Amino acid sequence: SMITLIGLGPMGQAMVRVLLENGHGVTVWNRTASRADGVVAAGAVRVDTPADAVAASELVLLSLTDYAAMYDILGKAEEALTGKVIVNLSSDTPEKTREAAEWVEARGAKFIAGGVMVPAELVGKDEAYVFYSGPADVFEKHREALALIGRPDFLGEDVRLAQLFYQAQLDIFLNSLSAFMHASALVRSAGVPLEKFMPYAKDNFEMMGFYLEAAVEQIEKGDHPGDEADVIMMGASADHIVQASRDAGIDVALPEAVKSHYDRAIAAGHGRSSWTSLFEIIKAD
Amino acid sequence: SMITLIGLGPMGQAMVRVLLENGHGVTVWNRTASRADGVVAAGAVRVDTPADAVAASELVLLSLTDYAAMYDILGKAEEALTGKVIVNLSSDTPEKTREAAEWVEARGAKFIAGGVMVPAELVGKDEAYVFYSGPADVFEKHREALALIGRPDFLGEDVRLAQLFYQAQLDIFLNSLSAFMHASALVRSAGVPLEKFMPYAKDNFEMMGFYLEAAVEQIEKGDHPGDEADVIMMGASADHIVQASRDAGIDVALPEAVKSHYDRAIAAGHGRSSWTSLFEIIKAD
Ligand SMILES: NC(=O)c1ccc[n+]([C@@H]2O[C@H](COP(=O)([O-])OP(=O)(O)OC[C@H]3O[C@@H](n4cnc5c(N)ncnc54)[C@H](OP(=O)(O)O)[C@@H]3O)[C@@H](O)[C@H]2O)c1
Ligand SMILES: NC(=O)c1ccc[n+]([C@@H]2O[C@H](COP(=O)([O-])OP(=O)(O)OC[C@H]3O[C@@H](n4cnc5c(N)ncnc54)[C@H](OP(=O)(O)O)[C@@H]3O)[C@@H](O)[C@H]2O)c1
Numbered sequence: 001s002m003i004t005l006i007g008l009g010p011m012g013q014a015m016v017r018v019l020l021e022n023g024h025g026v027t028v029w030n031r032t033a034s035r036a037d038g039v040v041a042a043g044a045v046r047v048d049t050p051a052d053a054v055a056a057s058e059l060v061l062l063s064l065t066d067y068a069a070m071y072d073i074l075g076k077a078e079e080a081l082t083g084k085v086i087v088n089l090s091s092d093t094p095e096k097t098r099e100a101a102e103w104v105e106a107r108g109a110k111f112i113a114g115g116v117m118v119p120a121e122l123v124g125k126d127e128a129y130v131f132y133s134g135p136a137d138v139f140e141k142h143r144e145a146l147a148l149i150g151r152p153d154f155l156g157e158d159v160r161l162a163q164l165f166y167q168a169q170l171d172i173f174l175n176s177l178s179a180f181m182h183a184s185a186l187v188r189s190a191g192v193p194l195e196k197f198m199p200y201a202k203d204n205f206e207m208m209g210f211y212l213e214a215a216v217e218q219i220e221k222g223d224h225p226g227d228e229a230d231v232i233m234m235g236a237s238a239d240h241i242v243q244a245s246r247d248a249g250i251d252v253a254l255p256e257a258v259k260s261h262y263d264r265a266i267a268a269g270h271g272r273s274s275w276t277s278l279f280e281i282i283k284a285d
Numbered sequence: 286s287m288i289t290l291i292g293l294g295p296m297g298q299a300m301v302r303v304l305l306e307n308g309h310g311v312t313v314w315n316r317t318a319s320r321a322d323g324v325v326a327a328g329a330v331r332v333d334t335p336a337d338a339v340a341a342s343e344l345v346l347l348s349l350t351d352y353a354a355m356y357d358i359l360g361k362a363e364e365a366l367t368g369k370v371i372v373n374l375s376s377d378t379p380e381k382t383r384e385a386a387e388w389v390e391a392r393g394a395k396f397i398a399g400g401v402m403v404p405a406e407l408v409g410k411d412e413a414y415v416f417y418s419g420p421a422d423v424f425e426k427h428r429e430a431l432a433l434i435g436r437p438d439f440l441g442e443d444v445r446l447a448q449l450f451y452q453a454q455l456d457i458f459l460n461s462l463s464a465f466m467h468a469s470a471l472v473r474s475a476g477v478p479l480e481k482f483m484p485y486a487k488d489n490f491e492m493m494g495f496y497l498e499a500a501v502e503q504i505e506k507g508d509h510p511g512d513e514a515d516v517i518m519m520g521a522s523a524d525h526i527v528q529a530s531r532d533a534g535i536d537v538a539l540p541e542a543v544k545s546h547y548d549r550a551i552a553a554g555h556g557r558s559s560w561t562s563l564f565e566i567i568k569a570d
Contacts, residue, residue, distance in 0.1 A: 185569070250568060
């Protein structure tokens, strides 16, 4: 049961290993031949060329930093893409994802977009899930295999959907990392150790589920009551974090961006509305 | 025991109600006399003047949008402050918090800073905790009372500590709300309802604790291994969220701020380091 995988970053590697562990034969190629050494030891079969990698399997998985990478690699293997199934598990733009769907299918391949929503350490484990979008019939044919990487959430036949859901998750995630480090940087400025603050940050993030249901209701109904907490008070909070950041001499870009949401809401007259009203100035009309 | 409280936002109100529920007499004043109606019904006693509010109790709690508000109000009760204990549960800057400590003590009162780390709906419940800082001996005298609002976490005698820990929490929190709304705004741009995405966002936030321990270790040791996930790949992710945001016509300030962290890390040569390396570019010189 030979499946190909191209791109042997942590993810590519962790995926190749799960495919090998569950009986499948796995052909690999990577720009840096020597990164494959570990998985080749485990049972994978390295090959000289990207075309050889594509020719080896029906199913071809890509784990690459961006879609530009798909073009650099598959560009040296076009004649062999015919009859094949590209599953691209790379981050890039939804718009660039569709543009990619069209190029691979013009070269005669079926294209599915995927987004893996776990670190490599948890690929193949219980917490693992993967956004997928594109041909439902082709996805079904290879579901059993892809299901090993993590729980497949098929979103629809619009190839952009998985990428859009991936960018959306990482929007929150990269924000939470940057926010965490920013808040930590504020406390370390006054000489507090990170280990004394981290438990509070943990609770902070773990408590987010409490707010999210009321938030979705308020946002979809355009109903933003400030009774519990208004944009004037939370705008002031944003102003304080910015000014504390300048006082401490840490980064101001991230808190100035949060303040800008409150500033635009205030300008739009949502002073007395719920913080959910920020959605009105964030969204596309 | 009569405890005074000034500022009858949702917080002030929820705190007054808990004090009344646990036997305490509560004197109130507010710039907007009619906001007291609810708590006066519940048992509180409104008074004409801020000076009267201060004179009524040993312990005086402030729940105000900012510290500037404390000055406007307590400014009309300067003579009345001798012997009193101000607990300021308002957001403002650590620097403005100390400057306030000194102003209050100059007028013969003890000053404690506090940060309440729950919404009004959870004041007095299990999840409730409150950062406190200032004189430990004065804090002990009034601990039993304040303990009702939420679990008191006394940080130290540096009055700024509670404010610093509050700003830090809201730094992450306001970021998480803005990120959540931003990601949601991306999904609604392609016409997906927010109810389809919210469960994934909930899991995303609930999963933050997994990364935070490894993060603190890597940050405090200046040890940033990229083996599992490097700043080149996560910088590219940030670029994708920004470009998807421009494509969708939503806010770009928040993702452009996250991208700016990755861009500065890359500039500092941390391309191949862990995302924890962003801390090097966020932290003070
Ligand atoms: N890191 C995580 O925990 C995680 C989790 C979920 C999803 N993801 C996403 O899934 C993918 C996993 O990436 P990763 O962190 O494992 O690795 P990465 O650092 O993004 O790079 C992975 C692969 O991309 C190749 N590559 C990049 N640009 C190329 C180009 N122009 N030409 C040829 N090859 C190119 C690399 O070649 P070399 O090895 O030769 O450099 C490598 O094999 C990414 O798209 C990421 O956004 C990551
Ligand atoms: N709400 C939350 O979820 C939350 C979370 C934790 C803690 N906090 C913090 O607790 C404080 C109050 O919270 P909140 O949202 O309930 O209240 P708020 O909306 O910020 O205002 C509360 C009180 O401040 C008074 N006030 C504001 N500016 C004033 C001024 N210049 N002169 C006189 N009175 C003034 C208001 O008087 P009026 O009634 O006349 O406007 C009101 O009684 C803030 O520092 C906030 O950041 C809020």
